[PDB]
Amino acid sequence: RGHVLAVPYPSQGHITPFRQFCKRLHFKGLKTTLALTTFVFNSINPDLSGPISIATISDGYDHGGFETADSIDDYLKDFKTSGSKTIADIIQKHQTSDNPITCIVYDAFLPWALDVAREFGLVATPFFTQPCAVNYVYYLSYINNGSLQLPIEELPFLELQDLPSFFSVSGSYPAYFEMVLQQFINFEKADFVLVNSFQELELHENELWSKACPVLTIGPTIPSIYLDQRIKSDTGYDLNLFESKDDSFCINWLDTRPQGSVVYVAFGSMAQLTNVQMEELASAVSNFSFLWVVRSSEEEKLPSGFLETVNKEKSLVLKWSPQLQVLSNKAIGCFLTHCGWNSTMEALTFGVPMVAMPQWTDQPMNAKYIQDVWKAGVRVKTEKESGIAKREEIEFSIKEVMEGERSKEMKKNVKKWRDLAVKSLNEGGSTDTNIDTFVSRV
Ligand SMILES: O=c1ccn([C@@H]2O[C@H](COP(=O)(O)OP(=O)(O)O)[C@@H](O)[C@H]2O)c(=O)[nH]1
Ligand SMILES: *[C@@H]1O[C@H](CO)[C@@H](O)[C@H](O[C@@H]2O[C@H](CO)[C@@H](O)[C@H](O)[C@H]2O)[C@H]1O
Ligand SMILES: *[C@@H]1O[C@H](CO)[C@@H](O)[C@H](O)[C@H]1O
Ligand SMILES: O=C(O)c1ccccc1O
């Protein structure tokens, strides 16, 4: 008779793994309530794929969300204040109910949630939505104090341009940098540490980070239908902040294309590219058959007249994609990606080789593992005066994944991950066992 209150950070790349993890807990017999901010809750269009219980909380920006904050530091500060009160509201209200909350799974970005869980005598477990290698680097910085020493002794192959953007773009995003460092301020006092990865994907880094902490890999959070198929209702991502266009057009359009012919291009839910970068992309893209996601707020930055000179026989532009169905479609030749962790793990488990074009935060690390560890893609060369990828380098990287000699080797190397993820989610696998360890304790 346990009840987990799950609290993601209010963004798509964090709500999705949290929701998928709750579906796994429901399948194991554990009730969950998902705590969403009021702005996010009123932004979702509910087409559910499974049972869901949602409580709303506040970050202090119910009306406008993050865009109405004065600054990133004010947003996180108000969210700790408002979010701590409204999380406590849910726990207190449920204390006289059939199933009082017994545990808080909270986003590692929000370590103040452990203070609330302690105040009510609850089990507390941070949930890291980024891979073990990224988190371990941040842990090493924190136990120093905000500084990392290259080379990292137990990971000597990493260079400065492989690190999270906060290290290589000096002074960038100081409040977000303090946030990722402060994920470890009280993890000492946490019962477990949960991570959206699976052990066979980063054995070395999972082993290293586990010496410091009790870490439980519980991923990948990809819907059950694509992998182990143990959860029959888990057919897709069902908490979308972005309207889905009514997905059939894009997937009908992909079915007409020859196998491996389409270059899929997407940058996640919040990355913003410059006009100069959009033009180098739009030029490089146009030498190929492509499916490119440009979010509605980014359409301004494409060259004027572009969305009409597209060749509609071979190519298509969307505001948002059904990315899971896109990546499982065999018209896809390769994935030009910003290397957000969900998109990386989705590309890996589906066997789609990548052109890595990291933009910031943990993306450079994922780009490095994509190219040099998993050997499932190549990283675009960026010119150093700008940080920008020129169209000729973007085109070279696409062709290297689409057709070169290492292209054939990268396709077989990435096809191994599906069965390893499936094995991990099935009975007796590392993730399935780690979920049972967590459920037993709760
Ligand atoms: O057009 C799109 C682009 C992204 N995604 C989903 O949005 C999530 C993006 O998370 P990620 O960690 O890759 O990037 P972030 O948005 O956090 O930068 C992923 O689950 C993708 O499958 C989608 O459904 N349609
Ligand atoms: C972190 O700061 C960045 C700006 O540097 C914000 O864009 C980001 O806000 C996210 O933006 C998404 C839309 O692009 C929303 O889906 C998400 O809820 C919101 O958190 C900040 O988190
Ligand atoms: C932070 O800056 C990056 C570029 O470095 C951009 O991709 C994001 O949109 C912004 O939040
Ligand atoms: O939403 C994310 O994926 C994210 C990742 C790193 C830093 C800040 C963020 O909002």
Residue numbers in the entry: 5 to 446
From the paper:
UGT74F1 and UGT74F2 are the enzymes responsible for the in vivo glucosylation of SA in A. thaliana. In UGT74F1, glucose is transferred to the hydroxyl of SA, creating a glucoside; in UGT74F2, glucose is transferred to the carboxylate group of SA to create a glucose ester. UGT74F2 exhibits the GT-B fold with ligands bound in the cleft between the two domains –the N-terminal domain is comprised of residues 1–245, while 246–449 make up the C-terminal domain. UDP and SA interact primarily with residues in the C- and N-terminal domain, respectively.
We crystalized UGT74F2T15S and UGT74F2T15A in complex with UDP and SA or UDP and 2-BA. As the findings with both mutants were identical, we will present further the structures of UGT74F2T15S. The UDP and SA complex structure of this mutant is very similar to that of the wild-type enzyme, with an overall RMSD of 1.4 Å2. In contrast to the wild type enzyme, the omit map for SA in the binding pocket of UGT74F2T15S does not have clear electron density for the 2-hydroxyl of SA, despite the higher resolution of the latter structure. In contrast, UGT74F2T15A and UGT74F2T15S form both SGE and SAG; UGT74F2T15A has wild-type activity for SGE formation, better than UGT74F2T15S, and both mutants form about 5-fold more SAG than the wild-type. Therefore, we propose that SA binds to UGT74F2 primarily in the conformation described for the UDP/SA complex (i.e. carboxyl group of SA interacting with His 18 and Thr 15) but binds to UGT74F1 primarily in the conformation modeled on the basis of 2-BA in the 2-BA/UDP complexes of UGT74F2 wild-type or T15S (i.e. SA hydroxyl interacting with His 18 and SA carboxyl interacting with Thr 365). This explains why UGT74F1S15T and UGT74F2T365A behave like wild-type enzymes (no carboxyl group from SA to interact with) while UGT74F2T15S and UGT74F1T365A impact product specificity (both mutations affect interaction with SA carboxyl); the latter mutants can accommodate both binding modes of SA. Therefore, impairing the recognition of SA carboxyl group in each enzyme decreases the product specificity.
